[PDB]
Design a protein around this ligand. Sequence first.
Ligand SMILES: O=C1CO[C@H](CO)[C@@H](O)[C@@H]1O
Lengths: 439, 439, 439
Amino acid sequence: RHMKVLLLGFEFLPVKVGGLAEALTAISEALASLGHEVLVFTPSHGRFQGEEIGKIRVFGEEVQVKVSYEERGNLRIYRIGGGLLDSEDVYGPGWDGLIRKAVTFGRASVLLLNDLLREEPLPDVVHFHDWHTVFAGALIKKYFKIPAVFTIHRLNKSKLPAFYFHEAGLSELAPYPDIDPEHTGGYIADIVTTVSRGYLIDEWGFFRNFEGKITYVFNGIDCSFWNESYLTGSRDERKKSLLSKFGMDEGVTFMFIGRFDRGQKGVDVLLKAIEILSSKKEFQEMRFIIIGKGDPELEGWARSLEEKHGNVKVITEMLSREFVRELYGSVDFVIIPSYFEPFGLVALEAMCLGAIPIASAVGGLRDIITNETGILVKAGDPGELANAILKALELSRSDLSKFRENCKKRAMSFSWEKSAERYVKAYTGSIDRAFDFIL
Amino acid sequence: RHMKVLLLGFEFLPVKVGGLAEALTAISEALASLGHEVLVFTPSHGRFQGEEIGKIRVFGEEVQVKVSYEERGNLRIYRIGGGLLDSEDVYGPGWDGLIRKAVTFGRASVLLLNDLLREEPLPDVVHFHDWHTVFAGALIKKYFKIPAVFTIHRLNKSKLPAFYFHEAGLSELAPYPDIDPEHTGGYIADIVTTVSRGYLIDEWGFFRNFEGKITYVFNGIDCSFWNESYLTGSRDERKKSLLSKFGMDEGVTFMFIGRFDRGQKGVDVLLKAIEILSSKKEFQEMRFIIIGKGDPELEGWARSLEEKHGNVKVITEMLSREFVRELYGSVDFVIIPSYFEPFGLVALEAMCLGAIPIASAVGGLRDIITNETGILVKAGDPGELANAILKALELSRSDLSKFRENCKKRAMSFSWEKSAERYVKAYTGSIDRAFDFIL
Amino acid sequence: RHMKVLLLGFEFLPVKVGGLAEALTAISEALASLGHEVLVFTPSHGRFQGEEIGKIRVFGEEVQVKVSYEERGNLRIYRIGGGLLDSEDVYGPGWDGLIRKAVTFGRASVLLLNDLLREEPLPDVVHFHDWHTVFAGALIKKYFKIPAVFTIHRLNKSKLPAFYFHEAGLSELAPYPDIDPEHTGGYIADIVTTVSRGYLIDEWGFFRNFEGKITYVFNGIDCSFWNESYLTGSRDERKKSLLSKFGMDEGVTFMFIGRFDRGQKGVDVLLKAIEILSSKKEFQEMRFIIIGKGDPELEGWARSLEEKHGNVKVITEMLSREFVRELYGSVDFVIIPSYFEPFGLVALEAMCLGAIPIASAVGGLRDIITNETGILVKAGDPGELANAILKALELSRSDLSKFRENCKKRAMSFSWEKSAERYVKAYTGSIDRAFDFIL
Ligand SMILES: O=C1CO[C@H](CO)[C@@H](O)[C@@H]1O
């Protein structure tokens, strides 16, 4: 039954950059709750000031390794400091520093584990996440010979000069002048995983190289927070109240939240879709809340539509989670026009608070959304999005209470416990995997 | 101690071409009797109609894979249908039909395992039997990386085109235009086994290639089934009753139960042996029952002797295992004049039920039969076979009850439990093996 | 754990050549006491009666293998005879003969393990000691695929011709014309160990080749025997009684217990130091007892000093093991001027009995002797040894009583039990090791 897991993560709470830190801490906590002893190795990034445990040679220079320690139940956390690991720029400083930081983290992890084997047994598996932890996972695999699992949360698609592999003591893994560290991590790993079944299919051109040892393991949502119990009144009352705060009157309400960028979150597709619809008679029946920032040309374009249309509103700030929870619980639909999506947490967050997703049929959004829980659409096509929005409006005159209930039931099925239980399977190879010849 | 075993066989009761089906069923039940969890994959051959579990691409076409499930204690059987696996011709249709049936068995077996691994732990070993299951054994070894034991029940000694290894997804196993699948099986296996010590010596020219990881595991005999307790009355009473059934009076009885072919079970040597004795005076004081079929020329020749003499009978139709038991318990002797013999399951069936075997001194028959439990003869020689039959008629006057009693006691020592116990040793490597330098 | 251990050693009590025989027996019994099943294979060296267990081919010749069996609780000892294994010359006969004997031990060990695996499980680890057993270790690892651990007690630093590896069935381990068998033993080993941290450091030029899988495991000492409890009277009484036997007065007594012709114990350093001290006034307070025998030139030098000084005593006759215990337990200081010392059992024997060691700072003597337990000197320097002896007379202020108490505490902590436990960590790989980048 019970196992001893070594989890290598390049970021961990309270260090927060993207969504990974939160994701790895949830996995690590969930594993611990199942009764597994979980050890976490992660850089301190200048957040913690630990005790000096030893010295290592890295890039022809001496470096004193420091360690900060926390223990919560079966979870044991180690923040490793020393050299570039004390640099606050989590993914830095610069492309050069980040790679050196990853290499130092690799040799520091071997030092720390080596000291632990002085008083305790070898871990059953080494679970390492993303290309930044590859040097650590490769080194631990190389010397201690324990099973390795590699999880890719998002493909970076970029090669590193052979130089950095030679310095990490992994020369044999660098037979060419440049190496993709995600290909190297998949090569040395026993089982490779990714965060959705759809993303695995979308990026098969790459994942194909690990046919028969590549699988999917879904992330989870904490619908202990994302939940309607924190909201008061009925949905209509909440929706009428929210719209008053925005300075709009009653209408079918659509919501976008995300970065304003190109070929990514698709706010540009949404904006063109609003322009297409603006000539239709049923446009003045629709309400649009667009939240986020980034590309200032897209922010200006977004602010032009707010200026030209009283039923469109834009907010270029990062709102709190409490305020976003109330937004998901008030709006009718959430629009997710992504060009690609590894998982799609925004969908789950909206679905748990009863908002109906209209999303691009890409990556994990295909796995999350179904016929009876939302609308999928062809990605990168404003006309087809505008048409999906028109179809969402006719639905709205019917009782959508069944749609909303199905969303809440489904979203809550994506638990972190289910996610953890399935990693335990991957750790022993007792798991299914992707084969090209299965139809 | 206890292990999850995945057993791959091409033949399984109630499907029955030769003694292979009975061998694989008994092994599987014996493994299960010892407390081990045994999963059997085997083709349906059109005898079982099952539920679809998915689809696979094989030879550029979509093939629907179906499964029929039977649970019987710790033994779990999966008859796999789809494409040529639905063909009623077990070892066909023809040479190429059998090969692509074997390739289909490979990818279908991966699909089923992949699906089982979605809700259960990975098996500790894969035990695959004869060259027909090599595609399945190799694929499961390649991807799932579990220990593999290859057991050869009969050596076919031929090569398949590389085309079929390419189509099976095993290009790295076919570096020439034509490939012996028995060499491939041995190569990729951790421990190779055959069904007797005598056959290992006889075919050392081949087995020599896997020196250091090659051994023998004797087949057994289900003396709980093959027993005189199911029969009633005395032996002479059953003997007289059976002889009168085919329209013959009392007299010493010899039996043959084997497939009609040129250089295998030796029906050609028996028929010519009968022609030598027909000129002699003792022929009228002898009875013959020649059960089997196959080759048209030999079928006509066996049929011709039946027409000439009211002394010889021939049965071509499918006899039950219950009726074959009754024949063994009635007849005085059993002739087993094979050119080669991997084991000799007919020998132990005859001996356990009381009949005295007359066998060729080849392969497993040397291990089974001794001077105190039967008559050994030079293989491929009709003269010495005829000579041994006359020596059998000399003993028929003497109460040879010790032959019958020593046969019973000797046959009982070859239990399937011992065979099962010894296969468990093979699965972990804890078994003795043949070395080139060990004389 | 309760693992099953197969231990390989070229000598084993009662066959004594160096210290290896006693050191392996103590390791084996300690493991047996901790509840592990231990199997020892060792050559008979023409000493013990055995029964034949089969034949092997070596060097184009047929050899009859013989075995003697001894059982002692959980310890099971197999002394393997046959061919050159019947040679009484332990490390012979001659250099070529010794290599052939070592090769014969390889194929004979494979034959014995092969027969044992007919009726018992495969051992969990193969633990082989020094280069003489590398043909056995490598062959067992090759065929049976079980975890290997290679312990170096002493480095011989020579290369053997490729011929011998080809005859041992290990052609793949000899791609060059000449091969260092100590390199070969580490390469094929999963974890390599050596008998001290200090000797690991001294020979890092060699051990660095197995960086990441090389570690140390100290030898031990039997403080059930080397104990003051057996000695009657106080230490003062014993020393005075000792000095009157040898015909001297009271004084600070120094002792040397080592074989002269064993150059590696620097008795010539001591003798020169005594000459340096003889011109000093405080020499008349010193008493010396040199024990051992060897070179006529060196014995003459010792017996010359014995003649010139009533201070000095030279004993060449073979002493009792009980008597040597009483010497350690009544002298003040023991001098160990070794040029090198992988462990330093003599220092522990003195310390466990209260004698304060004055020793060369080489190999395991650095690990055994601390500032609170004894005196470390620069190796091979008579002048620095003379100073150490002078400094010792100052400590003879009566506060060397705490030195003796510290020595007994420290000596006892080097038990064979603690050594056996750390080897068990080595067999699983759950142990700290030496890395190149850990400074
Ligand atoms: O000689 C034989 C060879 O194959 C089978 C074993 O799989 C036996 O049943 C048969 O008697």
